[PDB]
Amino acid sequence: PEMVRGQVFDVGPRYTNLSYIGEGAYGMVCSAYDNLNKVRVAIKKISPFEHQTYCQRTLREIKILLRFRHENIIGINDIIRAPTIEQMKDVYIVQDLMETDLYKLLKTQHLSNDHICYFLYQILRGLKYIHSANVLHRDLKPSNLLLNTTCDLKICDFGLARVADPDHDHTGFLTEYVATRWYRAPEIMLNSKGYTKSIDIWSVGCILAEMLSNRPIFPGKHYLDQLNHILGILGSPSQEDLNCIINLKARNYLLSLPHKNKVPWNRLFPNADSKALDLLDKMLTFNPHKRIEVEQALAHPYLEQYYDPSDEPIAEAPFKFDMELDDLPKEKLKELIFEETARFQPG
Numbered sequence: 001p002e003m004v005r006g007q008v009f010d011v012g013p014r015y016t017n018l019s020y021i022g023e024g025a026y027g028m029v030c031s032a033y034d035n036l037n038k039v040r041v042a043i044k045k046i047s048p049f050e051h052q053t054y055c056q057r058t059l060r061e062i063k064i065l066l067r068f069r070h071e072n073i074i075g076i077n078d079i080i081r082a083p084t085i086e087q088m089k090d091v092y093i094v095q096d097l098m099e100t101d102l103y104k105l106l107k108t109q110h111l112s113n114d115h116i117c118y119f120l121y122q123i124l125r126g127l128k129y130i131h132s133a134n135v136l137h138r139d140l141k142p143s144n145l146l147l148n149t150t151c152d153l154k155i156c157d158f159g160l161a162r163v164a165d166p167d168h169d170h171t172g173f174l175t176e177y178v179a180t181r182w183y184r185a186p187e188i189m190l191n192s193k194g195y196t197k198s199i200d201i202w203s204v205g206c207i208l209a210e211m212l213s214n215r216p217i218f219p220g221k222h223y224l225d226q227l228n229h230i231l232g233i234l235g236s237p238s239q240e241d242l243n244c245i246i247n248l249k250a251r252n253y254l255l256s257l258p259h260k261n262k263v264p265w266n267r268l269f270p271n272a273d274s275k276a277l278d279l280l281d282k283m284l285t286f287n288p289h290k291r292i293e294v295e296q297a298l299a300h301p302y303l304e305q306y307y308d309p310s311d312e313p314i315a316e317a318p319f320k321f322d323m324e325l326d327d328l329p330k331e332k333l334k335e336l337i338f339e340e341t342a343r344f345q346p347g
């Protein structure tokens, strides 16, 4: 097999001429030439079977992406793995090749308003479809938004996704959380497990702010500092929002803080479009029950030029399968990953 940066990348012979793109905790991603479709593709090598958590993230990624079909969501084109469960060590997932991601793009380019507007529209169009399937992404951020030269945008990474469960969203104050710190809604640190659609809208608001200034809006340095940053810009929560807070410890914490006035969006973003800032305000609303929903955000004046519900498709049915997968040992999850990838086997 070819080898990229030392490591074995055993995808031959359908995929050859490999080239490094990046890496992370998930594994490594390369570009490769597809010999059947005759085109370059992205291929990522996942090696998750030694730990339950890694198996859960792998199964969520595969199960969800195989069931979704939408222009603004990355698909899965092929899956390579051994013919038996005994021999299966690595899983290679083949996806459409894109040019870059929004994280990388914001390091080098300042985006015009019309690029921000079109990218935001596509994020929300893809999110409408995700949410219509009763799925939560739960880790939206610039590096999970893939882009090409024609400005097509595709959402990726469903490793932390879940089926929405508003009835079981409640948790205690300062409860541990896995998704990327800078994009966490304030309620994650106060009373929420991130099991409602509102969690994703907050992250989109953070992405919009980041496209406006090329800097993360709430760069918390650690868990509670994240909430410090959010309250530093939003200011102290209203009495009505405090009375919605659930937890004794969260209420006491917020009541103990000195009063903080809100930092106006037009002072943080003096060159931004006023309609973009009005939508940003509605996405970055403290109380998740008052935060704008995806369909309302699509209908906001900022996106009026693109808004077309007839061209913003929904999923044919909501997902009802387990995405917690909390009670399944890694051996059972390996069996499920094996079964879920069977359709790509030659025979």
Ligand SMILES: O=C(Nc1ccc2n[nH]c(-c3ccncc3)c2c1)[C@@H]1CCN(CC(=O)N2CCN(c3ccc(-c4ncccn4)cc3)CC2)C1
Binding pocket: 021, 025, 026, 027, 029, 042, 044, 046, 047, 048, 054, 055, 057, 058, 061, 074, 093, 095, 096, 097, 098, 099, 100, 101, 146, 156, 157, 158, 159, 160
């Ligand atoms: O889908 C993903 N990236 C893609 C996809 C298609 C692309 N086309 N073009 C590009 C591109 C990007 C940038 N510049 C140029 C081109 C693509 C990037 C990312 C990579 C990883 N993926 C998520 C994923 O594969 N899963 C969820 C996480 N999971 C997971 C996480 C951690 C661990 C783990 N393993 C060992 C140690 C620690 N953690 C294991 C499994 C595996 C399944 C999201």
